Coordinates of C-alpha atoms in Angstrom, one line a residue:
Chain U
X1 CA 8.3 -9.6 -15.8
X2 CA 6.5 -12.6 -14.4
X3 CA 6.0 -12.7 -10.4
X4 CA 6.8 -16.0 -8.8
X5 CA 3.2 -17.6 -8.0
X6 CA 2.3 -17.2 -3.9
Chain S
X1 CA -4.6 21.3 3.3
X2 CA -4.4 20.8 6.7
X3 CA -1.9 19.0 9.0
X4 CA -2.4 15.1 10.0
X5 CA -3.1 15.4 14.2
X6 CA -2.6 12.9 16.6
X7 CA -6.3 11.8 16.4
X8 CA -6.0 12.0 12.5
X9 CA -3.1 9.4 12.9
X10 CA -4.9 6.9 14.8
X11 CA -7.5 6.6 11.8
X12 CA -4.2 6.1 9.9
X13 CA -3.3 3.5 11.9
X14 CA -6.6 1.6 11.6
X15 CA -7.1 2.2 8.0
X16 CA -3.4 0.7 7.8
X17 CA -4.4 -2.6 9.9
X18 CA -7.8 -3.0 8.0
X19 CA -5.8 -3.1 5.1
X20 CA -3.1 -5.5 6.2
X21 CA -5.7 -8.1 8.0
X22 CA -7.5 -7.9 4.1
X23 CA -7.7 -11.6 3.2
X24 CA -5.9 -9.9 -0.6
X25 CA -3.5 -7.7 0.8
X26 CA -1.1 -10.9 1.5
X27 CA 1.3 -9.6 -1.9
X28 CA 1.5 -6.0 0.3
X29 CA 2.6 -7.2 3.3
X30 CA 6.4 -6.6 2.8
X31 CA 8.5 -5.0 -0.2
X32 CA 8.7 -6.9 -3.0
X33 CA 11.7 -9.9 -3.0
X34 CA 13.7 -9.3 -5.9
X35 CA 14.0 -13.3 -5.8
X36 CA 10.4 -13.5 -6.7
X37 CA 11.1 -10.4 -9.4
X38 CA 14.3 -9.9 -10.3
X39 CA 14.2 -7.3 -12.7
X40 CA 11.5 -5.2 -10.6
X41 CA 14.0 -2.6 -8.5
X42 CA 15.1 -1.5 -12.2
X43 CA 11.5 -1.3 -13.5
X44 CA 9.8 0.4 -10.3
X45 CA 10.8 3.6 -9.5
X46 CA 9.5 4.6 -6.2
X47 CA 8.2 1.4 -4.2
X48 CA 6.2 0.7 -1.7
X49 CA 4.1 -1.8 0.6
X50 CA 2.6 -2.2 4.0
X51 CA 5.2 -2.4 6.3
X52 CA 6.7 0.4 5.0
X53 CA 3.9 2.2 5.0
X54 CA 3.4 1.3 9.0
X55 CA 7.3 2.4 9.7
X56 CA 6.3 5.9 8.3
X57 CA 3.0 6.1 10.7
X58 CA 4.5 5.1 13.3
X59 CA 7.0 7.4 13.0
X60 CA 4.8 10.4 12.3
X61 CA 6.4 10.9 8.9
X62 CA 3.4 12.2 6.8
X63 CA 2.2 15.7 7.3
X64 CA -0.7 15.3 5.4
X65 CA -3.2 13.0 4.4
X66 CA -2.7 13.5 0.5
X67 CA 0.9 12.4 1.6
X68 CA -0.7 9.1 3.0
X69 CA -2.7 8.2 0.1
X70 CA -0.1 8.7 -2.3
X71 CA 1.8 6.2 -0.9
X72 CA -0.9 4.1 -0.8
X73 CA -1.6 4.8 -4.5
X74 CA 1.8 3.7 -5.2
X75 CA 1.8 0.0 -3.7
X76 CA -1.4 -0.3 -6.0
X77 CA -0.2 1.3 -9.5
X78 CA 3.3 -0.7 -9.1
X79 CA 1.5 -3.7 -8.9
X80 CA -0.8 -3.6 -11.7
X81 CA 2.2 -1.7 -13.8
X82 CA 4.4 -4.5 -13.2
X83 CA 1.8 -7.5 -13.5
X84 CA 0.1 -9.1 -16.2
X85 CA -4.1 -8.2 -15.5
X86 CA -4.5 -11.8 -15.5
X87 CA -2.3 -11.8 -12.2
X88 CA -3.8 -13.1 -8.9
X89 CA -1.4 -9.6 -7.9
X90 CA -3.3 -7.3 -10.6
X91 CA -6.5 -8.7 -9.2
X92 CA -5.4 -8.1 -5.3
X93 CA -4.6 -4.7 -5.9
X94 CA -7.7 -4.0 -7.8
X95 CA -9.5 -5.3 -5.1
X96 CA -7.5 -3.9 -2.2
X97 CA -7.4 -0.5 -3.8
X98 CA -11.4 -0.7 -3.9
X99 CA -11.5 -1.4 -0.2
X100 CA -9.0 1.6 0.5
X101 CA -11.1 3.6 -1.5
X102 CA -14.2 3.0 0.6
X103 CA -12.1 3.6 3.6
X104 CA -10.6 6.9 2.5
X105 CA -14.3 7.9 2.9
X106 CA -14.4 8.1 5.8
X107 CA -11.9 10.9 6.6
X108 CA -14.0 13.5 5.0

């Protein structure tokens, strides 16, 4: 579960 | 433990936009986009963020102050359960939850 960078 | 009043909610209120003007709350604003997560409404039970957070003040949902901080709690712990500790997110909570922390102190 990686985040999508800001 | 007692009952929130309405002089008790206007320190909730602050507290709330102290948090949100934080130059690291910017993951917290808003629930989390499932297009930026897909998998995270299956993984997180019970989410939570900011503007959720200020629907509930402003509707005087919270009876007590524990009630309040739980919440709060919870936008933290999901992130850093969800995130890798070498996240800019895991950092931002760790430092947002330090800065609610020193806040919370000042309820008594």
């Amino acid at each position: 579960g990686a985040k999508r960078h800001r | 433990l007692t009952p929130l009043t309405e002089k008790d909610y206007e320190g909730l209120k602050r507290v709330l936009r102290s948090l949100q003007a934080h130059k690291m709350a910017w993951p917290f604003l808003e629930p989390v986009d499932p297009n930026d997560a897909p998998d995270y409404y299956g993984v997180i039970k019970e989410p939570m963020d900011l503007a959720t957070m200020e629907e509930r003040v402003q509707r005087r949902y919270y009876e007590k102050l524990t009630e309040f901080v739980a919440d709060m709690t919870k936008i933290f712990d999901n992130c850093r359960y969800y995130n890798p500790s070498d996240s800019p997110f895991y950092q931002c909570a760790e430092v947002l939850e330090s800065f609610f922390v020193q806040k919370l102190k000042g309820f008594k």
